[PDB]
Amino acid sequence: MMPTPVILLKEGTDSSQGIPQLVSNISACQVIAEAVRTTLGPRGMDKLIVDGRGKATISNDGATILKLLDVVHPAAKTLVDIAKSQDAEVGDGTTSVTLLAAEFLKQVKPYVEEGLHPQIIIRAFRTATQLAVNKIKEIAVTVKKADKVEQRKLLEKCAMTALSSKLISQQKAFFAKMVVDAVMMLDDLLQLKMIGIKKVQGGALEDSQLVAGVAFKKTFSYAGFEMQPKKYHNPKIALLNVELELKAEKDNAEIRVHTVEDYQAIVDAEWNILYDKLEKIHHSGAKVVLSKLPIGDVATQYFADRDMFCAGRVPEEDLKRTMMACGGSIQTSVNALSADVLGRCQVFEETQIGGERYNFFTGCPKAKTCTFILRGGAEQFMEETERSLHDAIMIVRRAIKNDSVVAGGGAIEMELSKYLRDYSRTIPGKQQLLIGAYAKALEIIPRQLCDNAGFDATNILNKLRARHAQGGTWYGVDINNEDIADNFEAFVWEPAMVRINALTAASEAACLIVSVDETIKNPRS
Amino acid sequence: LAGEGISVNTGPKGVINDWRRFKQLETEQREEQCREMERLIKKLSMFLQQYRKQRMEEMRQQLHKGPQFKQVFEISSGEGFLDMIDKEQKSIVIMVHIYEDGIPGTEAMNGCMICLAAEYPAVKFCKVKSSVIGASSQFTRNALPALLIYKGGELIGNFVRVTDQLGDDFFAVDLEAFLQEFGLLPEVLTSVRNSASEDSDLEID
Amino acid sequence: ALHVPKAPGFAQMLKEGAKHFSGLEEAVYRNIQACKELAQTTRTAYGPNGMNKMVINHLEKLFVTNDAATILRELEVQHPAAKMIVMASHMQEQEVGDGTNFVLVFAGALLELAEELLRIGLSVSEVIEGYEIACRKAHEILPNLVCCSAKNLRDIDEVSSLLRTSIMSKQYGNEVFLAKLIAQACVSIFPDSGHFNVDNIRVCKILGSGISSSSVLHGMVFKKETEGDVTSVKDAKIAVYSCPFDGMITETKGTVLIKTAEELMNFSKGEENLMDAQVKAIADTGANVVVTGGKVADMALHYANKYNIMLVRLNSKWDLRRLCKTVGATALPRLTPPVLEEMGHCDSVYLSEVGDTQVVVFKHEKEDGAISTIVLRGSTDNLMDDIERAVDDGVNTFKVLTRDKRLVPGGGATEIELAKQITSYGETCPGLEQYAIKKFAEAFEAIPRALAENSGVKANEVISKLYAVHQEGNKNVGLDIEAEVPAVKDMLEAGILDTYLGKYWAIKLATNAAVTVLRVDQIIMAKPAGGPK
Amino acid sequence: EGPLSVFGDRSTGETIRSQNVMAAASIANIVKSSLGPVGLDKMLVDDIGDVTITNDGATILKLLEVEHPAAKVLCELADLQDKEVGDGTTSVVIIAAELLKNADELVKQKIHPTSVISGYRLACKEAVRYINENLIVNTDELGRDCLINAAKTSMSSKIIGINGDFFANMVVDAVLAIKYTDIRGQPRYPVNSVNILKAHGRSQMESMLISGYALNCVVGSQGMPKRIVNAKIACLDFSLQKTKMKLGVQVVITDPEKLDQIRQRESDITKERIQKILATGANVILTTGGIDDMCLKYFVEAGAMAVRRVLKRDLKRIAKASGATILSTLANLEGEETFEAAMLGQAEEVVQERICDDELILIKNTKARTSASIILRGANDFMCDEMERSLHDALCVVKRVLESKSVVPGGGAVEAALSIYLENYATSMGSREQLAIAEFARSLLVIPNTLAVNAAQDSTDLVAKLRAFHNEAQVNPERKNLKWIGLDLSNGKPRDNKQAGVFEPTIVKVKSLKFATEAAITILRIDDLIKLHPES
Amino acid sequence: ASLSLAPVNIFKAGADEERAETARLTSFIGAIAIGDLVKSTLGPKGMDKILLSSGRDASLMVTNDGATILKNIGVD
Numbered sequence A: 001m002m003p004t005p006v007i008l009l010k011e012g013t014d015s016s017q018g019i020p021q022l023v024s025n026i027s028a029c030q031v032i033a034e035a036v037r038t039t040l041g042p043r044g045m046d047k048l049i050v051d052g053r054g055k056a057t058i059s060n061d062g063a064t065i066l067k068l069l070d071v072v073h074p075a076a077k078t079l080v081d082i083a084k085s086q087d088a089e090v091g092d093g094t095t096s097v098t099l100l101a102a103e104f105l106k107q108v109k110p111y112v113e114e115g116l117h118p119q120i121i122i123r124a125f126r127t128a129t130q131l132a133v134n135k136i137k138e139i140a141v142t143v144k145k146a147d148k149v150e151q152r153k154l155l156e157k158c159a160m161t162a163l164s165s166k167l168i169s170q171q172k173a174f175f176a177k178m179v180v181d182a183v184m185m186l187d188d189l190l191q192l193k194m195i196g197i198k199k200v201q202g203g204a205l206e207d208s209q210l211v212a213g214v215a216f217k218k219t220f221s222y223a224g225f226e227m228q229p230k231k232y233h234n235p236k237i238a239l240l241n242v243e244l245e246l247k248a249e250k251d252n253a254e255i256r257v258h259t260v261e262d263y264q265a266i267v268d269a270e271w272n273i274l275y276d277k278l279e280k281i282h283h284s285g286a287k288v289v290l291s292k293l294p295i296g297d298v299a300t301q302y303f304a305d306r307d308m309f310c311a312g313r314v315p316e317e318d319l320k321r322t323m324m325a326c327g328g329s330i331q332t333s334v335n336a337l338s339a340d341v342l343g344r345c346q347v348f349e350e351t352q353i354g355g356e357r358y359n360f361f362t363g364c365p366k367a368k369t370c371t372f373i374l375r376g377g378a379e380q381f382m383e384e385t386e387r388s389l390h391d392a393i394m395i396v397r398r399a400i401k402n403d404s405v406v407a408g409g410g411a412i413e414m415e416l417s418k419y420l421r422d423y424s425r426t427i428p429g430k431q432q433l434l435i436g437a438y439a440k441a442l443e444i445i446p447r448q449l450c451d452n453a454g455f456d457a458t459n460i461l462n463k464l465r466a467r468h469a470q471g472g473t474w475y476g477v478d479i480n481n482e483d484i485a486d487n488f489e490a491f492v493w494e495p496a497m498v499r500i501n502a503l504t505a506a507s508e509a510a511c512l513i514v515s516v517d518e519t520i521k522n523p524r525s
Numbered sequence B: 001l002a003g004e005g006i007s008v009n010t011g012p013k014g015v016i017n018d019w020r021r022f023k024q025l026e027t028e029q030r031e032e033q034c035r036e037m038e039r040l041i042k043k044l045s046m047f048l049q050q051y052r053k054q055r056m057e058e059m060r061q062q063l064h065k066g067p068q069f070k071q072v073f074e075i076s077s078g079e080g081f082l083d084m085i086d087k088e089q090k091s092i093v094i095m096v097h098i099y100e101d102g103i104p105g106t107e108a109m110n111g112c113m114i115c116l117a118a119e120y121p122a123v124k125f126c127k128v129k130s131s132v133i134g135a136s137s138q139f140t141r142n143a144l145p146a147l148l149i150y151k152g153g154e155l156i157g158n159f160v161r162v163t164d165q166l167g168d169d170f171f172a173v174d175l176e177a178f179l180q181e182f183g184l185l186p187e188v189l190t191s192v193r194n195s196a197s198e199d200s201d202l203e204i205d
Numbered sequence C: 001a002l003h004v005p006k007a008p009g010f011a012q013m014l015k016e017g018a019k020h021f022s023g024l025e026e027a028v029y030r031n032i033q034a035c036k037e038l039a040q041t042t043r044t045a046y047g048p049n050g051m052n053k054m055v056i057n058h059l060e061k062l063f064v065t066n067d068a069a070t071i072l073r074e075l076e077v078q079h080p081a082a083k084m085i086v087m088a089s090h091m092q093e094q095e096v097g098d099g100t101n102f103v104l105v106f107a108g109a110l111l112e113l114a115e116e117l118l119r120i121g122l123s124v125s126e127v128i129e130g131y132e133i134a135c136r137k138a139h140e141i142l143p144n145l146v147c148c149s150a151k152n153l154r155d156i157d158e159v160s161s162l163l164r165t166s167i168m169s170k171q172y173g174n175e176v177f178l179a180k181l182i183a184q185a186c187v188s189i190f191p192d193s194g195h196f197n198v199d200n201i202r203v204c205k206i207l208g209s210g211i212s213s214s215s216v217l218h219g220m221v222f223k224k225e226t227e228g229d230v231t232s233v234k235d236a237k238i239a240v241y242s243c244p245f246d247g248m249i250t251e252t253k254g255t256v257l258i259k260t261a262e263e264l265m266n267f268s269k270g271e272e273n274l275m276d277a278q279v280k281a282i283a284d285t286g287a288n289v290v291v292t293g294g295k296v297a298d299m300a301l302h303y304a305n306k307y308n309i310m311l312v313r314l315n316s317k318w319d320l321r322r323l324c325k326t327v328g329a330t331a332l333p334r335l336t337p338p339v340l341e342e343m344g345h346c347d348s349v350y351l352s353e354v355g356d357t358q359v360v361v362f363k364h365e366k367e368d369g370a371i372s373t374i375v376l377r378g379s380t381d382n383l384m385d386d387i388e389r390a391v392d393d394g395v396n397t398f399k400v401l402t403r404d405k406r407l408v409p410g411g412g413a414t415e416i417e418l419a420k421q422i423t424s425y426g427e428t429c430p431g432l433e434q435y436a437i438k439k440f441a442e443a444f445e446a447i448p449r450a451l452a453e454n455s456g457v458k459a460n461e462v463i464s465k466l467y468a469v470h471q472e473g474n475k476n477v478g479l480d481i482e483a484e485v486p487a488v489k490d491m492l493e494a495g496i497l498d499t500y501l502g503k504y505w506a507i508k509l510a511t512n513a514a515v516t517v518l519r520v521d522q523i524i525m526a527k528p529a530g531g532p533k
Numbered sequence D: 001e002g003p004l005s006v007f008g009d010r011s012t013g014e015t016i017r018s019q020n021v022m023a024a025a026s027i028a029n030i031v032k033s034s035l036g037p038v039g040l041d042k043m044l045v046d047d048i049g050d051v052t053i054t055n056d057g058a059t060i061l062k063l064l065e066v067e068h069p070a071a072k073v074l075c076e077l078a079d080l081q082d083k084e085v086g087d088g089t090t091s092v093v094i095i096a097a098e099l100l101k102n103a104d105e106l107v108k109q110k111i112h113p114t115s116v117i118s119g120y121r122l123a124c125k126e127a128v129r130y131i132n133e134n135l136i137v138n139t140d141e142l143g144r145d146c147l148i149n150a151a152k153t154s155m156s157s158k159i160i161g162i163n164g165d166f167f168a169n170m171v172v173d174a175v176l177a178i179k180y181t182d183i184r185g186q187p188r189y190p191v192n193s194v195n196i197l198k199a200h201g202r203s204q205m206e207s208m209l210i211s212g213y214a215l216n217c218v219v220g221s222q223g224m225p226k227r228i229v230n231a232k233i234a235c236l237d238f239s240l241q242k243t244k245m246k247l248g249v250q251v252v253i254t255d256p257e258k259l260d261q262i263r264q265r266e267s268d269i270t271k272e273r274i275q276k277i278l279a280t281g282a283n284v285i286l287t288t289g290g291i292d293d294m295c296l297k298y299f300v301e302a303g304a305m306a307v308r309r310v311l312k313r314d315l316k317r318i319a320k321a322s323g324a325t326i327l328s329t330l331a332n333l334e335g336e337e338t339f340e341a342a343m344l345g346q347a348e349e350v351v352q353e354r355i356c357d358d359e360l361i362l363i364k365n366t367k368a369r370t371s372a373s374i375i376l377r378g379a380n381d382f383m384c385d386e387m388e389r390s391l392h393d394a395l396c397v398v399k400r401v402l403e404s405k406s407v408v409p410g411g412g413a414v415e416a417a418l419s420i421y422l423e424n425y426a427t428s429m430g431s432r433e434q435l436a437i438a439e440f441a442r443s444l445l446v447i448p449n450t451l452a453v454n455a456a457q458d459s460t461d462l463v464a465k466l467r468a469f470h471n472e473a474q475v476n477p478e479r480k481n482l483k484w485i486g487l488d489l490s491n492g493k494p495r496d497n498k499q500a501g502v503f504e505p506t507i508v509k510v511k512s513l514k515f516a517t518e519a520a521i522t523i524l525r526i527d528d529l530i531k532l533h534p535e536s
Numbered sequence E: 001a002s003l004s005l006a007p008v009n010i011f012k013a014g015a016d017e018e019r020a021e022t023a024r025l026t027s028f029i030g031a032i033a034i035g036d037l038v039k040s041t042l043g044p045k046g047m048d049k050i051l052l053s054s055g056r057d058a059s060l061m062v063t064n065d066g067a068t069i070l071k072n073i074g075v076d
């Protein structure tokens, strides 16, 4: 570097070019993969991350762990991005995508180090990924009978498989059944916001319940609330968006009077406006009144005197959930409270749950929603339970969309690796090495399962390879029995789109990282 | 190792003379630190536009006063700064200028202050050195232009590093307009003087 | 006798931080070296085998790409000569849309050879004159090198084949799919009227499914949600309002004056009834979708839900105008019901969910309209940004083809033919300008040389083969990428073609930038001081 | 820190293994660019302006500052290879680093390090046996051409590679000159007896091979002659000065008349010694000690050349070559003090020659033994130092070839043949030792890969072609002549290296393999590091 | 094991902890100190105390009441 009197770029600009920076990128990707390596499979563990402010998060989800890692390496951020992409599109396999991308890069690192042109590697990756995706679509098992109960078993098995890596895996059947019921409750769009998830401190996991309706915490009861009855056997619910209290008519409203009679008339007029709104609500026939805006103490006492129920400041999501469960309409005005705009539920009750008061709307027969109430001994316990349930819910939604499954536990990738090796044995040889490297890299997941479980990875991998060579598509790792087994007959089922998206994202990340030859870091402003 | 309830008892009242002697100097320092942080760390550690009226403003500023140009007052010590900031009526605005000789852009703003003081008798333009105030090295190295404002003992302006928004060869009208953008500047020639008991006059009575 | 004082005169009067470079070797050679360095930095991203560069700006934003203009934009250059060359490249991008790397490489080669000529004994004036004469000769020669023309722009296959080359340098592995996508999007736009608007093509980046899932939509996609509870319409009758969906208010000051109890008791009821009447009047025109540019009042949303009206709230005015263009509605300034002509009609409006993003889709079943949207899927934000940049390059290529249909052979064939013809011309002309003309011709070799270097083969063998073939008579022959040894093939048969207008503008801009750099003799640099932006 | 309570860091498990592998890979990558004829030299700035330009791996690793213990292990391995063989330093460093990297790759797959170590030992033993049994070439079939080709092969990758046609001839002649026989009839070649002198000036083609010895010294006095046509050399290990009585002897004068006599004797003793030395006809006097001015005057008057402050090794070599006897003192077995003419070395000529503004002594054509010296000319001092290092490498290679008459084809042929043979052989040893030996065989392929990479050529295709050729050689009995197929970096095609005259001593490959295997075993055995804090 | 005498530290900066003997010692010393301070002002012949405030106002208080003595002291 000869010092020019005036330099081209700013002082402090950094530039790494050539093979060394590509090898550095591969090593950084390996480092990122190692940070989520042990959170895979039924024997996977959890990672605890403490941020700067002292709050700690405990998670088995790969996407969450990668998000909480403030990764600044430009090539390493690609793995985080593909994990986020897998979480967004599918919801499960966020660890598999990172492991697969890092393994692709690790396998092709020796060829990069010896001067192979990266375009050849990129083309080989594209061809191998296309072949693998087509093979997955070809060999995926689907049941085209449209049977309800068969679909129930399919969804339950998929949810159980998705749940058998978390802290709640010991209660996988209970939560899998709850998730399947919750997802089937949704009508056609399967909105996540139609599945409420409430966490109440204290209580075992087995005490968690799914309510066929809506439940939410008590919202700042005013004076006279304790006089209101807390159970109704056929209530009509008035879903309202109205502020029921004494207040100024409007912000820019002024009153000008010059007589004491007019003063008294104005005061009585304000009181009459409030009482007219309350009387309209009462004569609508409703027994339970929910409002988005605050409900004042005067309205609370008015409803108590009529043996009614009131709840102000109910959150927007809770009102929407109540509208879908009971079947009303959020009314911004009370002038037309007809019968068809009032929600109806079989039973409404307020009960103590773990040191908190919750309002329960149960018995709705045509509800299009539900609510999860999760119990546990710690806040992060509940957060990780919610994350696991979200993974299961996403899997069940995808299985509703498309009922095509492949056996998990590495069986699908063992079959894919065998097929790719067989294909690579029939090409001139420059691409043969790279496709063979792809096939070998496809073996990372079963090896990682065996390593996490503490087996001998080499022996299990040899057994699986020989078994797949002599026949048997769905033979994978059996964690409990220390050996291999038919994962399809073991009901280790995952949707095909999970692995399809995993392979596509890993290949895209590997091709993008390989294609970079130079990185430039401008000085921070 | 006992007697945690020490109860010093008679000790203090026989030594509070020296304790208060130390505390007087401690408080004299403490007011100095309290007053010297109000600009530090917070922002220290970090064709009508042609304005044809500014030219005639400059020419009329050139003919400001006859007697003398006068020089901006220089603070010699921190105690002097303290007792001229604390003194004086709170109804008048006092602005203080910090500089170190050698950096560019100091003489220009000093001349701007001189011109404004000439054309604003109410203002009490004053300047201080960065070394006499004993500020942080970051202030001495990257915050040379500092125009502190004291209106009633509190800031209504904390302009630091005004070089970017003023340039390096700005004139009096530029600084005047920039300060008037935020409303900092409040809105005849006798022979020499007129001022000369209270008994005025009477007639016969 | 231990110091050298500053020479009396300008040296002493120069400011403290200022810098003054004067003379040939102190200014011209240093500018040439700086431009050489810039061209060298950007060179390795030229051609289909170009390698992406991860560029991080001063805001920690990550740009990975091989687009030369983007790399130059995110590289905060400091040298004034390189700054002027970057301005030339940006002007080339603005005028055409592709060819920035060609501009940079040609300018760098021209300045290199200009330095060589200045060293062997030529002067700046004669070098500049020779460069200008050679540029005129090249601009005269270029129209004769045109091989074929577009000859059809409404055919999907023809435009896809034409646009394949432009989006083949970027995203080399998978260019046919993107070619078909951009071809469909552009053919939907570009009506019987000859004018084509690049802005009419919209790109939506949705994460999750890899670019093989990308598709084109004849309409508009907004990453928003619906205010109301209606989430699907089958025969939409959009009425677009540029005013917030609320009762309009005075503009000086609105004060509600109450003097009797009856007015206080009736004010809210009257306002509610008025707004209900307004919404009912809007709905009576058959409208079932209402798009507003402002806020939505709670009572307004209530009465819209009561009458089953879909609500979409677009914050930006550009989105509102684009929706008006693509649906055919008129942005009403008041809340009055829309007349029949101002009513907008879209064949289907619904709320969907792509990946995990909620979107509102204005979908036409016809293969026409005023705006077409390309929905981009992917697994990384940077990857989708690169696909978007390739989309803009393809759209700009389509625009150029609409402006000028002539095409020239790519793959270094045109540059080699130009170099050969200009070298032949320079032999005839006597005088000192022949050296500059020959150097200008030789500077065209930097394009096939860069292509061969990026492809991984020896550039000298490729250039020798190209000269041999062009001496034979075949003027449509360039280097073959799909080869492990230096080889050449016909470019017209392979369809590797690039726009004549783009090459013409790139040559003109590169020559102008090189000449302008050469003209400067003295440099007076001010103190950098501050001014971050 | 925790319950262990030690004042320092601690790394356990895969962390320390990866750290050691990273350090070894860093050491390898430092020198990977200076391997093969297409390699390039390096510049080492000594942080104080001193510049060294070199291609030798041992010199590079010696001059660098190294902190990690594994990197120090590889540097010491390079130094050991340089001391014990003299060639293949870069090769042994690269091979050891690659072996360690592949062994760690195996270990990370839950293969126990003991299995990998046993497999490495078996692979090294089998590789040595295969090399000694199949890949060796007897040099008796080639004569002097084999020596010339081995020297030329050592010349490549060095600053004197292109001039190998002439430098190899010089090296072979110099090594053959210093050949001497000893007990048990083994002809041993004492390299480092060839004095190499550096003096910048004319081109490399003006380098002189002296048929004698070359001193870096001048005559003591300007009045002395600077050329003797018949040299009678006397070698002295003592100094010729005014004699000073020892510490235990003190001069006490009580009668003043004795003082002048004592003072006269104090120098007459040395005068008598010099007269005794010169009376035997000695023409050239070399001494390790200083010479006083009066003694220089005696030698000037006698018309004899006297050289002072001669280095001990140079004096020993001159005495050995010319037949002189080193005399630390003049004292016979009869208690007297005499110098015999029978202990005078004889040379045909001693000349004070001038080389680039500097002057030096040339002792030409010593009798009763032949000795050789080399004077190197270059553009400047840096180039001359590089010439000296490359020349020493070539001399060591020629010595190894002459002592052990077996050579092996160069250009990565040995590595590819070993890789093929060991990959085939690993199928019949153990279960995980199979993997260890296979990884050893794959690691051996790092040499031709680096050679091809240094030439900016297709390493993959070239290595694949080499492997195909060697597999065909090993599988087809009638194609055993393909074992010599190596790499031709000029054209990037496989080439018969035995025909091309690309040779290396077999000891180079054998010692490189053994040393690299042992270093990899040493590093691989570690799984925990405790780094105690310094006492400050 | 104990919180304080454990290889792993479980407290913030400045948080302390006293086990059985140390906590008992601290409590007993504090109580005995208070009792010894308040006494000697007990009974007909008890004496008074001077409560010299260390604040800016420097309040002076001469008292015999035990509660006033105990409330007007800095107790840790």
Ligand SMILES: Nc1ncnc2c1ncn2[C@@H]1O[C@H](COP(=O)(O)OP(=O)(O)O)[C@@H](O)[C@H]1O
Residues within 6 Å of the ligand: A039, A040, A041, A042, A044, A062, A092, A093, A094, A095, A096, A161, A162, A163, A164, A165, A407, A408, A409, A410, A445, A449, A477, A478, A479, A492
């Ligand atoms: N019961 C099981 N037996 C064997 N393998 C399993 C079992 N359940 C899940 N797996 C495998 O573990 C892998 C990781 O799944 P998991 O850790 O739940 O989520 P992620 O895929 O996001 O890491 C999956 O690829 C699946 O094939």
Ligand SMILES: Nc1ncnc2c1ncn2[C@@H]1O[C@H](COP(=O)(O)OP(=O)(O)O)[C@@H](O)[C@H]1O
Residues within 6 Å of the ligand: C045, C046, C047, C048, C050, C067, C068, C098, C099, C100, C101, C102, C103, C165, C166, C168, C169, C170, C409, C410, C411, C412, C451, C478, C479, C480, C481, C496, C498
């Ligand atoms: N398949 C191909 N084979 C050979 N050359 C090609 C091929 N595709 C494109 N090119 C050449 O690459 C050049 C485009 O370079 P590019 O990276 O697009 O620079 P820019 O973006 O500045 O236009 C064209 O001049 C064309 O001749």
Ligand SMILES: Nc1ncnc2c1ncn2[C@@H]1O[C@H](COP(=O)(O)OP(=O)(O)O)[C@@H](O)[C@H]1O
Residues within 6 Å of the ligand: D034, D035, D036, D037, D055, D056, D057, D086, D087, D088, D089, D090, D091, D092, D153, D154, D156, D157, D158, D409, D410, D411, D412, D447, D451, D487, D488, D489, D502, D504
């Ligand atoms: N003329 C040649 N042709 C092909 N290969 C050669 C030639 N000369 C040397 N080599 C090979 O190059 C390799 C590198 O040698 P070099 O690095 O110079 O020796 P050292 O390792 O002692 O520094 C040697 O192993 C040798 O086999």
Ligand SMILES: [Mg+2]
Residues within 6 Å of the ligand: A092, A093, A161, A162, A163, A165, A391
């Ligand atoms: Mg999972």
Ligand SMILES: [Mg+2]
Residues within 6 Å of the ligand: C098, C099, C100, C166, C169, C393
């Ligand atoms: Mg382009």
Ligand SMILES: [Mg+2]
Residues within 6 Å of the ligand: D087, D088, D089, D154, D393
């Ligand atoms: Mg060597």
